[PDB]
């Protein structure tokens, strides 16, 4: 949103581009998108249309900037049988042109009954100077709704770097010098080795269990019993019924 600082905006966009798992990024059209250069997304959905022509133009230009590297599909959601269909058809350009013809004071302008009927009967580029009072009207309305509701990072790292032990500082210098060794991890396609090792182990286990069964057979070939208790020999009489 616009309340996220520029550094936060860059951090969040870099995180979105880096983490391929994030499925959607939701952005405010009023956020200064002009600070986001690269977007690794191929689909843009406009939930609602901005009434400010300058902001709509900025959003369109931004969507065009992303499309320089890949084909993009842009979807505009519009509520049928609502004012949104008319605002999609003609935007605010005709309204601003009509009000500008009556003068520079938008607070005292009156709209023609035909325009009102065309907008509300539900079933050439405008320069920013001409749109400014309209934008100030929009701002005024938004603020009225709001009234209805109503040490540098480098110095921090320097303090942190000063708390590191000498061996940690050496490790820092070593990793900085070996900039070509950021791939120190032995990442390899372990799956193939696992696929072969599983079969080799299954065979080893089959062999070991066969040898165990053979040893048990040898142990059973040996005599099982050679002695019996004194009670069975003399203290009891064997009977059959």
């Amino acid at each position: 949103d616009e309340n996220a600082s520029s550094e936060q905006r860059q951090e969040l966009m870099r995180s979105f581009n880096r983490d391929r798992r994030i499925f959607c990024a939701i952005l405010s059209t009023h956020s200064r998108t002009t600070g986001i250069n690269l977007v690794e997304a191929d689909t843009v959905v406009f939930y609602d249309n901005d009434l400010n022509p300058v902001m709509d133009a900025k959003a369109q230009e931004w969507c065009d900037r992303i499309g320089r590297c890949k084909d993009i599909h842009i979807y505009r959601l519009v509520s049928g049988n609502s004012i949104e269909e008319k605002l999609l058809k003609n935007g605010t350009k005709d309204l601003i042109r009509e009000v500008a013809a009556q003068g520079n004071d938008y607070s005292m302008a009156f709209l023609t009954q035909r325009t009102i009927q065309e907008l509300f009967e539900v079933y050439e580029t405008i320069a920013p100077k001409i749109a400014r009072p309209f934008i100030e009207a929009l701002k005024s309305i938004e603020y009225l709704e709001e009234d209805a509701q109503k040490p540098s990072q480098l110095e921090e790292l320097a303090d942190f770097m000063e708390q590191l032990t000498p061996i940690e500082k050496y490790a820092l210098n070593y990793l900085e010098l070996f900039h070509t060794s950021i791939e120190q991890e032995k990442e390899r396609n372990s799956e193939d080795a696992v696929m072969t090792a599983v079969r080799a182990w299954e065979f080893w286990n089959l062999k070991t269990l066969q040898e165990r069964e053979a040893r048990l057979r040898l142990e059973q070939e040996e005599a099982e019993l050679l002695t019996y208790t004194r009670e069975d020999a003399y203290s009891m009489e064997y009977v059959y019924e």
Binding site: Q153, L157, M161, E168, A171, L172, I182
Partner: protein
């Protein structure tokens, strides 16, 4: 445990490089 130590130091190096890159980008933007 050694790999864990070196991974932590690698993350610290990443953070330092990121802050220095952001400082350089801010200097490049301010000079205009």
């Amino acid at each position: 445990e050694i790999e864990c130590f070196w991974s932590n130091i690698e993350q610290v190096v990443e953070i330092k490089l990121r802050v220095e890159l952001e400082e350089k980008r801010k200097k490049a933007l301010n000079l205009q």
